[PDB]
Symmetry: C2
Subunit: 472 residues, 2 copies
Amino acid sequence: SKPNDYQKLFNNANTLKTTTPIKHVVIIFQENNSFDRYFGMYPNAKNPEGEPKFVAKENTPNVNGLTKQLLENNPNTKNPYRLDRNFQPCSQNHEYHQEISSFNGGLMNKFVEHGGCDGQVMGYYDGNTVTALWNYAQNFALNDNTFGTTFGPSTPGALNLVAGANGPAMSPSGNLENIENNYIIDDPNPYYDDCSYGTSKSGDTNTAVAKITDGYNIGHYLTQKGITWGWFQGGFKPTSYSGKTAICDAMSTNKFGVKSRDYIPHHEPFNYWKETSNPHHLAPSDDKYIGSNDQANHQYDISEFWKALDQNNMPAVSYLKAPGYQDGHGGYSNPLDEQEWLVNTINRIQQSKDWDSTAIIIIYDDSDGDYDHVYSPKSQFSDIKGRQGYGPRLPMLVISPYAKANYVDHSLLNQASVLKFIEYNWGIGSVSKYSNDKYSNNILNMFDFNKEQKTLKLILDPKTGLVMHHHH
Amino acid sequence: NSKPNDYGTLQKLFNNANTLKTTTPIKHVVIIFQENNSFDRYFGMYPNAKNPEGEPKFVAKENTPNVNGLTKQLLENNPNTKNPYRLDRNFQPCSQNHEYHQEISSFNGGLMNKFVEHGGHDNDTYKQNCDGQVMGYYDGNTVTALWNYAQNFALNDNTFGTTFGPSTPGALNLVAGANGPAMSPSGNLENIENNYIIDDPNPYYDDCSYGTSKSGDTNTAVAKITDGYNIGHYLTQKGITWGWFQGGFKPTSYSGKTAICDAMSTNKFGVKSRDYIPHHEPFNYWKETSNPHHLAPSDDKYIGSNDQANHQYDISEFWKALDQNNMPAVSYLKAPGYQDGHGGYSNPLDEQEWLVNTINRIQQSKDWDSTAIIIIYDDSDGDYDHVYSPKSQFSDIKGRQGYGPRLPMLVISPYAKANYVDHSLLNQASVLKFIEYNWGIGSVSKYSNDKYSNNILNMFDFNKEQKTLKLILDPKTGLVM
Ligand code: VO4
Ligand code: VO4
């Protein structure tokens, strides 16, 4: 119920030596959707009356999605079906062991049993609902062969994105059902975070906390090299303080009336290492120091990204995490609120003076446990207890003036491919002996650095996802 | 095609491969291109063998990695109308249907559940002699050598045919990463779609394609590649020693200037077949890289270099080059038919004899220290494999659907990780990618999948202090000698 015992200005990202023309990568880390749920039906939409109309461009390449056979004779006890945009989607079961059970040894036929609201595990959306996401694929690059580095929920997902490893780790509560063979398989809260504890509405007295005990994440290396970087999350800014201790009680109500916490502590991977943490959610020492070294330790409210961007101090590496209601997670979020966040954010970055050297990556943390038909290949760590993977397949997009347009990359990626790109582009090696970065393919087939004409900005209506300063 | 077509418009010693600049310690790659077995058929049950009395015994070593193979669920509750089942050592396996379209039909939109329906042949005949064999798998009591290679070297369980379909697309994909553009004097028939070869037309530039040879067939159309290069073009340009070395390539006679390839062998089950299989010789589909009259090297010293042979050789020429310290930088080995692994006319035991004798002999040579041997297959026979293969970048192009079925892939080398399963996504053009990477060549053509293919470097450890040991086996059993 209470928190446990726990200035240097960087050169502008634009001046840094990089392997590619990309000077700024922005990773928009959304929640809880399988590849098939979002793109299985791409690029075919129902187009009923009164919903945003989607019509695919001629010669849209195909995705490894939901075929006639998968739609009509699914091995599961219920067939895939089209989810309504007007209803609030539930959250399915994304526990490590449950997801493996759904996969059922390759049969991929126990999702109703182990992903179960019931039956929504089989639901998919099309372009009438995930309109923006589908329009982004129509104009930029999509990968249909990207997987969670391990099976399991949101905390392994976040740790794998920034370290390519989900441990080694310890908890004061012991392993419980959170940790297996030193690797985090569920969602203990981060140790070094005031807002994990019962003093915050965003915290939980009965959620265990965990810390990483060996191996670095990417932040160690970006800080060391003087590369401007940050994790920017909705709700990170405390609503109040209670004697040194930060209180994160910010809440929003989603389109479907669900009020939820803005800040989700177990979605903040850098606060699992002591070195990369900002436990008191300290604001930047100044707007000028966003992305550099100071009391914030590279951990920020989402508001600070926009201050940096608008002040010509866009970081080299920015992770963007929506306020809860917009992160795309079932139950408390949904595709319409997510789309507003996605469209507003991506519109704003494209309008900025740094769009010309930017790559935006949309990737997910976990599948919610939702149906996807692909029996994921093994990772090099799959024989190690607590590191089973690869996990379920996820949406992955690259939005950039250097992105291939209306292009589907079939290259085998995992969450540590994002890590691989950062390492490749800024000249950093493998983060640790635990990391999957060493085995991950890069994302370069989603880019064309040789073409003369740039891929143009795509400005959309945040309320519909349909095609519609510099400063907002 | 009873007689050879007209071939239309009618010497340089390369430096020793050991003197060449390379990216890695590998100065010699040997690609042993076997036939017609899916990953699951050969390795789905790895590393668990039945070990019935009298059959060559396999136990797995401590810490053998797991493969993406046949689980309890796939074994007991398979989506197909018949469950996977263990094939015996003791019978001549049939050949299943590895046609481009039939294989796609087995996959059945991702259900992977129509193999009995489409992996078989609708044939009297097949029904009475072969029923159910599409679902058969072997274990270490049959494919003993191959399982022991995996136990001592590197195996990849995520390697696929570049396209769906049979042997010719596989061979073209291996050497070019593309199965066209191509044309046949006979038109498409069921051989070509959208100028890509989807079945087995014989090579145009090969005397032994035609009815004059028992290896040939009057009623089989020929085809040629009309645009785009293969790796041979680049190796020759660059003066890198290379060859394709195949059993039965040496003609048994000449009728005027026409080579006759009538060599035959009898397998262990009494099945007699042609040693030479023209539609397995990919370089003869390009005029530029062909040796249509099967001319011999000008001299042993010229094996791998430029002369009348144009880098196309009888298997016998490989051993000569090896024994005389002129091992090529790049060598493709193709067994005489009876030992190529293909159902119907070959089998695991004849194949195993070929593999063991070949690999023993390379390991015993002076250049093993700088060699990597790759074992990879051309096609799956249409045999069961559970993996719904991911798409290639050419999958929306008619005649180029892929990736096709998953195949066995091994790397045997003093530099190979030992008892290691690489899960990297490979396809047949990954072999091409390795050659290009190692010897400093770019993509072969705008048509090639090489540019989208991962390399095989996760199967090597060039940094470890102790070299991977030789594995000398008994060709009769595949057991350690
Ligand atoms: O681990 V989560 O329920 O925040 O997708
Ligand atoms: O297409 V082949 O039957 O020579 O494996």
